């Protein structure tokens, strides 16, 4: 909820600094992705409604323990609000924040030898919207600049013209580009008037709608409940 509410590059990067990797990953096994399933949408049809499970559905799915699984889990958290199930990551990586995993060399993780085309295919980039596409490219650029693979990032953008049009305009090493950036990246937010409490056809659309509807209640009643648990505890 908090990650999807951020609407600026500054706010998104600030949030990733304060958020440990534990929030990105999940401890629920979920189901295997890329499965043609029939779900129930009784609002519209009596028959079952076909759909395909993906990594950006907003529901935890099983993921491998390699470097790609950890990166895919982080990107899913940014664009869908929920991560995947990577078994036994270890306390050493869980305490580190998301940005250090993306943009630092002290994590002990070798993020080189990463193919952005393969990762984009696995995350179903063809199904995500402009804001989700923009957030995914931000993670790619941070990973590319840390490992000195700026050429491979440019090659990926050249092959994908639609992604090149909406590419973020910041440079990871320069602070001036971050402050002057005018991108809008807010998936959820408090809307003028309201939105009907009705279901949607797709798994992604319905889960995204559930986040928007619950944001208003989460905004008002989160400070006290979080503080009660935060008090008398040490942060990871």
């Amino acid at each position: 909820m908090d990650v999807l509410s951020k609407g600026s590059l500054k706010e998104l990067l600030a949030h990733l600094e304060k958020t440990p990797l534990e929030e990105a990953i999940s401890y629920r096994i979920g189901t295997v992705p890329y499965q043609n399933v029939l779900i129930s949408r009784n609002e519209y049809y009596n028959q079952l409604y076909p759909d395909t499970t993906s990594l950006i559905d907003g529901v935890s799915r099983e993921g491998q323990r390699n470097v790609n699984g950890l990166i895919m889990s982080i990107i899913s958290y940014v664009v869908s609000g929920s991560g995947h199930y990577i078994p036994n990551i270890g306390f050493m990586l869980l305490r580190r924040s998301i940005l250090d995993i993306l943009t630092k060399h002290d994590t002990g993780l070798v993020t080189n030898n990463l193919n952005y085309g393969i990762i984009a295919r696995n995350l179903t980039v063809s199904k995500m919207n402009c804001e989700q596409r923009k957030r995914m490219l931000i993670c790619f650029k941070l990973l590319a600049y840390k490992d000195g693979n700026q050429n491979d990032y440019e090659i990926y953008l050249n092959q994908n013209i639609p992604l090149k049009q909406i590419a973020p305009n910041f440079i990871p090493g320069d602070m001036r580009t971050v402050i002057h950036n005018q991108d809008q990246l807010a998936i959820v937010g408090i809307p003028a008037y309201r939105l009907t409490q009705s279901t949607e056809l797709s798994i992604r659309d319905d889960n995204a709608k559930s986040y928007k509807l619950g944001y208003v209640d989460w905004y008002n009643s989160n400070s006290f409940l979080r503080e009660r648990s935060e008090f008398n505890l040490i942060r990871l």
């Binding site: 979920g30 079952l48 799915r61 009907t196 409490q197």
Partner: protein, 301 residues
Amino acid sequence: ANRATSAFLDNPHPVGVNYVDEGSRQFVAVAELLASKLIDSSRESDESNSDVPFVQAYSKFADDNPRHLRVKTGGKMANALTNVIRSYYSINAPAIVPQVEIDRLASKATVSGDMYNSYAIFNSVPIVEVLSPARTTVSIVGSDRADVTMLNTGAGAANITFNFGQIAETVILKGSVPFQLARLNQPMPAARFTYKLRPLDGPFIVVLPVGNPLVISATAATRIQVPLAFNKALVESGFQTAMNDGLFDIQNVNYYSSFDEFIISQYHAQDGINRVSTCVILGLALQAYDQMRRALPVRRV
């Protein structure tokens, strides 16, 4: 040589491993409580000739008021409940409902969510294995009352072994004619019509003479921990509705005549103790599905 077994006990498919935590259990218990309020409010609305009781109950249930020129199906609560029921049945069924929706829906009421407050008695009779000699024919028919028909041709005094498993608590045997039955390495008692057996005592040997087919009718009782709100009449009715609507039309699954056979078949499989816990949560969810669907009837012939 020949081996026979109950039809409903063969190849129990795995159950879902999702939505079994404390928060998900609270969501199911909330759904059952609010679905019950929907049924009573519909009765009150019918008697009072007003829509006030139904609107209040539906608004609490669906977070939205009933809408004109728009079928009332239950809103997001109905969608979440229907999908988790599908997930409980099989692993092949997907996990679609996010965790944020469940926590929001679980906060509507103040239910405990305990799944081990009380007990229930299930009547499905498990006949795991009936072993017969070469010249004897054995048939097992039925789930609520198993009729075992055995014919012996030639020779004399064929010995048939009965294996009722270990989960069932008590099994009652009734025969068309008095018959002899005793445990392994025990003397055979005088022929009598009925026997009361503990399935854990061991395999049971029954003496079957030549001619005059003897039919044994067996009824069993099994106790399973269930919540206090559990009602078997509502669960069974919800089970049939779910099957008719197609919620259980998943690949590589087994279909059963009743919830009694479902819970017993899962109990008799390997790691069946942890399967029963998921089945009980499915029973409570089907209880809510039945009351919700009777209050709001979408299907019209």
